[PDB]
């Protein structure tokens, strides 16, 4: 019957701000005796997840005093205070009052700083994946922020569609930026057919788009 | 001093079994509760069930979407905790984790396991070196790497020039092509003029297929 809402799914802050995460039970869970058994977790990228409060408002062992949580019967809070790096990752709350148990949805924390443009690369195929009959082509945009941006991939100049995928790197633990790679796949006859294949792209930090280009010669 | 290890998980054909353990120590095991969470790639963590400690009869609960498929058992001499998982889905795809329920909480997790049920069969990976091609734009810093492509199933590690390589290094996370097979690119920053002089090497690890492969990235 219980149902857990987290919010907000997402939540950007800076550093040294102020993060706070609510969570919402349908349904009261506090105990007779007076114990109310809703904690919070934290799952950094990569490794697994960490207790972090107990008991609604208890500090786990190794929780430096910044984090804090809060809140009555049905509405519960954690609060971050003068963030930093490390405590980038996905918070948790959970309820443990009744069966069966339930995790909130969830809360990805990133840390917002100042925008960056991006370093961008081009990368040909290599004539060893030729003899294939696949040529994959690798658009390279390194360390920039935010993470939104947009890749067009043009072939003879002709705008290409479908046939791309992104992947973007986790928030760099140093500078807080991000990398994202491109990849246009064609068929190795559709690769030796054109001649100038071009990444071009736009970016908050870039005035006018930047584009990189080669050609198959 | 507390310490749970997982074991157990892999690649199993739908519909299949496979049996997850985890090995406790530094505790009293038959005094708590204990554990299992899954969490499938860019999910959420979900709650799957728990087993009770000795002042309960170690009785089980479970969560709607395992209960009558997954059961939860433990080797008390052994201090050894198991998840039985019997008619695998896909949608049981997931790194799984067990708890110590302790702090009135879960206060101490596995490592995680990794669980993949797939007809797909164990296929080793291609490696092309990703090299800046005759225009080289007359800046400072050139990059450079390797594709990992169509493997299956994940995951594949990368390395560069053994592990001596690491600053400026972006090995991004896998993607799942209009096929069924995942590939990668992993890629490093150096200097324009470092190119030719020197040699970049990109160390491809990929256990699931007991592949092992040495690219060099010549330009």
């Known amino acids: 019957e219980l149902v857990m809402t987290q919010t907000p799914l997402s939540l950007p802050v800076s550093l040294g701000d102020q993060a706070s995460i609510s969570c919402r039970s349908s349904q009261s869970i506090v105990h007779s005796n007076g114990n109310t058994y809703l904690e919070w977790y934290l799952q950094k990228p990569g490794q697994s997840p960490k207790l972090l409060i107990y008991k609604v408002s208890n500090r786990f062992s190794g929780v430096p005093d910044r984090f804090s949580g809060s809140g009555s019967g049905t509405d519960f809070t954690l609060k971050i205070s003068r963030v930093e790096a490390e405590d980038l990752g996905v918070y948790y709350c959970?309820?443990?009052?009744?069966?069966?148990?339930?995790f909130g949805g969830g809360t990805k924390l990133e840390i917002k700083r100042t925008v960056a443009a991006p370093s961008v690369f081009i990368f040909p195929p290599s004539d060893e994946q030729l003899k294939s009959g696949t040529a994959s082509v690798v658009c390279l945009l390194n360390n920039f922020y935010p993470r939104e941006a947009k890749v067009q991939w043009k072939v003879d100049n002709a705008l290409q569609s479908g046939n791309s995928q992104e992947s973007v790197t986790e928030q760099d633990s140093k500078d807080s930026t991000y990398s994202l790679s491109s990849t246009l796949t064609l068929s190795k006859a559709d690769y030796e057919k054109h001649k100038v294949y071009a990444c071009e792209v736009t970016h908050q930090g870039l005035s006018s788009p930047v584009t990189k280009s080669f050609n198959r010669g | 001093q507390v310490q749970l290890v997982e074991s157990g998980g892999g690649l199993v054909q739908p519909g299949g079994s496979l049996r997850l353990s985890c090995a406790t120590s530094?505790?009293?095991?038959?005094?708590?509760?204990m554990s299992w969470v899954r969490q499938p790639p860019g999910k959420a963590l979900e709650w799957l069930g728990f087993?009770?400690?000795?002042?309960?009869?170690?009785?089980?609960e479970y969560s709607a979407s395992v209960k009558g498929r997954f059961t939860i058992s433990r080797d008390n001499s052994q201090s050894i905790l198991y998840l039985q998982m019997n008619t695998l889905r896909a949608e049981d795809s997931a790194t799984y984790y067990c708890a110590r329920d302790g702090s009135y909480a879960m206060d101490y997790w596995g490592q995680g396991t990794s669980v993949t049920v797939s007809s797909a069969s164990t296929k080793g990976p291609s490696v092309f070196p990703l090299a800046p091609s005759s225009k080289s734009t007359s800046g400072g810093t050139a990059a450079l790497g390797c594709l990992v492509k169509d493997y299956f199933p994940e995951p594949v590690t990368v390395s560069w020039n053994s592990g001596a390589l690491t600053s400026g290094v972006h090995t991004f996370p896998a993607v799942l092509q209009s096929s069924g097979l995942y590939s990668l690119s992993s890629v490093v920053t150096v200097p324009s003029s470092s190119l030719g002089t020197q040699t970049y090497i990109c160390n491809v690890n990929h256990k699931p297929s007991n592949t092992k492969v040495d690219k060099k990235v010549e330009p």
């Open positions: 087993i009770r400690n000795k002042a309960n009869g170690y009785t089980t």
């Open positions: 530094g505790f009293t095991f038959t005094d708590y509760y």
């Open positions: 959970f309820q443990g009052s009744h069966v069966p148990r339930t």
